[PDB]
Symmetry: C2
Subunit: 249 residues, 2 copies
């Protein structure tokens, strides 16, 4: 009854030609037998290298960011440029972009809507800070972030949308997030989607956990009913990512 699992490797801004070639070979020799959509998300300059080496049939390639339109945007990569090179997935609204580079709900929701219009599969990120979690605002924030995105989409566009919950309150703060605390936000989000968008949309929507995931807690995390996979960080740069994929069965 669960939708198709997703295991996304968020390499962030890391990697060398030797690093990636060695890691991609590990990914390719890993035989995966269950239905699961795997995702590598390298830096822009490494997309051609990954395109040349990544062969495992379970995988697609995603950009870590994009802008909606080509033009006078020095330093940025546009979605049409990404379609032309053969990339159909993109991560939008990551906490690091909302924090360091000032991406707002209006910017993130506009990127998701324009990516859905241009045929992208989107992993849209939401999450709340510790200060927000201290104020009993987890729902207030993650639903305000999810409503802003939904306000620019129609029903059919939700088949391209994937949500990734970032427990930002458990990132670099010295605080930890339990598999029960993750399942709580994951069901909180699905019920909002069930109520506001549709019941069939909620049951099929993939909600990924974007917190600390390793080979030890992946299966127990995926054991929860409203967790549909992971947005893996540190462990994704390791052969450990194979075990994380194994745990989505």
């Amino acid at each position: 009854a669960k939708p198709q699992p997703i295991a996304a490797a968020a390499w962030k801004c890391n990697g060398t030609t030797a690093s990636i070639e060695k890691l991609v070979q590990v990914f390719n020799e890993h035989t995966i037998s269950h239905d699961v959509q795997c995702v590598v998300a390298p830096t822009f300059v490494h997309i051609p290298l990954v395109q040349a080496k990544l062969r495992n049939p379970k995988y697609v390639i995603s950009a870590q960011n994009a802008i909606a339109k080509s033009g006078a945007f020095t330093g940025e990569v546009s979605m049409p440029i990404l379609k032309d090179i053969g990339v159909h997935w993109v991560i939008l609204g990551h906490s690091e972009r909302r924090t360091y580079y000032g991406e707002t709900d209006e910017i993130v929701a506009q990127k998701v809507s324009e990516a859905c219009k241009q045929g992208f599969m989107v992993i849209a990120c939401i999450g709340e800070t510790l200060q927000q979690r201290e104020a009993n605002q987890t729902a207030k924030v993650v639903l305000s972030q999810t409503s802003a995105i939904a306000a620019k989409l129609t029903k059919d566009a939700w088949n391209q949308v994937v949500l990734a919950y970032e427990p930002v309150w458990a990132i670099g703060t010295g605080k930890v997030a339990t598999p029960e605390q993750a399942q709580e936000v994951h069901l909180l989000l699905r019920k909002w989607v069930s109520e506001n968008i549709g019941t069939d949309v909620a049951a099929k929507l993939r909600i990924l956990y974007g917190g600390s995931v390793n080979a030890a807690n992946a299966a127990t995390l995926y054991a929860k009913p409203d967790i549909n996979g992971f947005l893996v960080g540190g462990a994704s740069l390791k052969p450990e990512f194979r075990d994380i994929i194994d745990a989505t069965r």
Copy 2:
């Protein structure tokens, strides 16, 4: 006059078909004078250009970078650029100063880290129409340059290239004359003359980053303090060859 530079600022434009076609046109254009030609494609197009662009007079630059690798989603670091073989970088572009939070101090730190890591930097400065109309042309460009200069040693200036953008002429209905461009280049080199050293000022490349095409590149490069161009829309066209020939 030091070695001129002809840089192609492609911005966020291009496909694999159009880049491969234009690179071949650049490949069939023989350049027989001392000039450093630069092509700066999007991050995704850097491997294509490195493989295909074969003119010995060209190098490949990035349009942006950050100092260190790590948990910075969507960004490309400077060590990653060095590992893939990129040794040039455009920093502090007006579009990033305007729309992506690159303050004078953020540009200054990026330039400093880039020179520390062995990068050739094209650092961009320029003033708005509001600023120019407030008689702030010197105030803005020198404040942008002095922030960059406070993070650089004398030897690091041999890796830095200044690119003046007449931002007051972009999308404003105003246009910049060569005499207005030379005026800014002059006072730029003169501040370096009197705050870094007469030696660095003489050998500093200061590129014009306004409207450059085949019709005006010669008249522009004829100005004594203009050392080349950071070319926009014309850089995606075969007439970039005529701009290179205008730096003779």
